[model samples]
Target: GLIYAVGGYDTHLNSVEAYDPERNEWSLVAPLSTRRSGVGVAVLNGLIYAVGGYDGTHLNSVEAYDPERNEWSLVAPLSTRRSGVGVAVLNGLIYAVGGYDTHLNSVEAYDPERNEWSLVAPLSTRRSGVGVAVLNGLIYAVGGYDGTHLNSVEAYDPERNEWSLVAPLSTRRSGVGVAVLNGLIYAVGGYDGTHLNSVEAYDPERNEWSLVAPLSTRRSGVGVAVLNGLIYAVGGYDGGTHLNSVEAYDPERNEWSLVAPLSTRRSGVGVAVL
Candidate 1:
């Protein structure tokens, strides 16, 4: 599958989508070593990596899926347990950012060539369920609940190995889905007082966040990925029920279009281009 929906909620059977669930109804797909909630996912060197997340407890264990082998192979563990972690790539390294384990503020980077993960600068504030993405070579960490759902944002400059606060979102968001497209960073559906359908975009040059067309369905813990430079919002929790509805955003058109739903209805999902 060019796209993969990894480690989220779903039972052992009768659900889950693989390779494009719409292509075939093979809803029962491959599994990870255990399970995860708030799992962070990203692609590096053609392998899809699942970063630290909570199963029963916070986990530092990491693994990558080899599409050809059709199996997930373990990778070096991160420095600390990081459930609700934010995972993304930059300059060839996979970054595992702030997550919980006493509400951690740590960060780690996986070096493919070295076959290991090493500590990097920690975030200025603790974040779990934070929306993270890259734009113009800088990594941005968005709103998440700490004492309360936060609107404050931060930018990590690898060139300087530091994190700096950025302009804030209009409202607080936790379990928000973030996708970068057309040089702008989009923060989609998330949780504030209730599930949010509202969407906003950040213009790095202007350091401002502008409202965009919102999702048709309020989706919290949405796992958004970039496929073909288009923003794809995957399964998420819709208040009372887990969701299967999938949607895509074409920033060029600045509109939301529905896509085939996932085989499984789940949330806190980990997804990426693979």
Candidate 2:
């Protein structure tokens, strides 16, 4: 399986790595053309798309990487410059959700085929560090911070080009991460003005949120992804310090178990499983 990740910051960072579950190890990969933080990544048509992030200042530029060539090429910039945006691929297009760019609530999408980005329906509430996942062709945008931490959740239906409210998070937090496993959407640790270890799960069919197991450590700006039925909570900041810790969530058991730590202790990253 493929674990496509984005590193945390502005300025230039040489940090680029990928995880191979079969080997249970992370290997160094080619670094991004520019250094950035609070970045989001998505895979479409076997290629990795890296979107808006901060490099001291918010970035509007986007890039695409091809694993086969081990090279990255520039893509169309986002319509709005932002950091901490949540990005997901649904129906062959990449949707970039809410993130802070002076103020939040900006939403846009990029069409790889057209190599262009267009403004889309904005989120119900403004937020940054939110988590987005595509399920059954709909995009679920989970918790993030507005002026303060929030628990708001919203769903975007591309077919109708509309957004509707969903169940809010059990815990109000920002910089949180979410992953979908089976029928459950798991929301992981984030900051509620303070670090938190709380985890919540959403059942789309029920349109409700229920508390799940908490993370072993309180953290924010975490990255999450699901692969082979297991949900992985990757790198994040633990308030006072950055972390390289990786934790696995077992839906069947409703629990979290520590896994391999990341190579770097950072937050505001993105994880995608291929």
Candidate 3:
């Protein structure tokens, strides 16, 4: 499997990189058309779409990348300018939910076939830097900042075009990394006034959240994805500095171990396993 790391905050970069585990190397790829940081990215139908984010200013612009061509092309923009949006793909559509510009609770979906985006039901609370993941057929939006750090969680049902409150997290947070594994949602490190190392898992069937093994380094703005049954937590910012260190969690071992470090220190990076 290949892991893609896209545009992020250091110098408000447009550069993209991909890591090959077998080769144990990271190579540069085509950069984005516009500089972006805190962007939401999701894969749909073999293409990677980079959604709303900050680039000096809040942005509504969107772009899609083709792995085969190593190129990026502009796509339909969002209805509202936003940064720190949480994105997830389900039912063949890309959903962008809750973000910074005005601390939005608004939710929208993009249809690649039509090259368009349309508003969907909004969250119960406004948030930015939220963590989003899809399990079964539903989308889950976890902790984020809403004027204040949040511990609340919510779920959306595309079939009914509705959003409902689920169980809250054990600790309030924002800038969290979330992914699904073994049918459970895992919310990783984030900030809750202080940088955090805490991690938690959610069980939709039980509508409950339980503490999980914490990260070795307290961090925020981490990039997390599930690869081969392991959760990889990539570069992020600890309270005092940008970090290049990487860590991985083995569910089978119930613990985290250090992985290779990124060549450059970074925070607000986007990661996807392909």
Alpha-carbon TM-score of each model against the true structure: 0.93, 0.95, 0.97
Q: What TM-score does candidate 3 get on C-alpha atoms?
A: 0.97
Kindly give the stretch of ten consecutive residues in candidate 1 with the minimal lDDT sum: 12-21
Model 1 Cα displacement at 116 (Å)? Answer: 2.0
Off by over 4 Å in 1: 11-16, 19-29
Q: How well is each residue in 160-254 modelled by candidate 2, as lDDT tens digits?
A: 88889988887887888888889778888888857888898888889999888888988788888888788888888787777788888888897
* lDDT of model 1 at position 14: 15
- The alpha-carbon deviation from the true structure for residue 48 of candidate 3, after best TM-score superposition, in angstroms, is 0.9
- Cα lDDT tens digits, model 3, 1-274, are 6777777765777888887766667778899998878888888998888898788699999999999998899999999998999999999999999998879999999999999999999999998999999998999999989968999999999999999899999899799999999999999999985899989999988999998899999979988888888888878889888877778899888899987677666688777877
Output the better candidate (1/3) by lDDT. Answer: 3
Model 3 off-target regions past 4 Å? none
Clashing pairs in 1: none
On residues 107-129, what C-alpha lDDT tens digit does candidate 1 reach at each position? 89999999888888989888889
Number of clashes recorded per candidate: 0, 4, 0
Instruction: Estimate the TM-score for candidate 1.
Output: 0.93
Residue 271 displacement in candidate 3 (angstroms): 1.4
What Cα-based lDDT does every candidate model obtain? 0.83, 0.82, 0.88
Q: What value of lDDT does candidate 1 attain over all alpha carbons?
A: 0.83
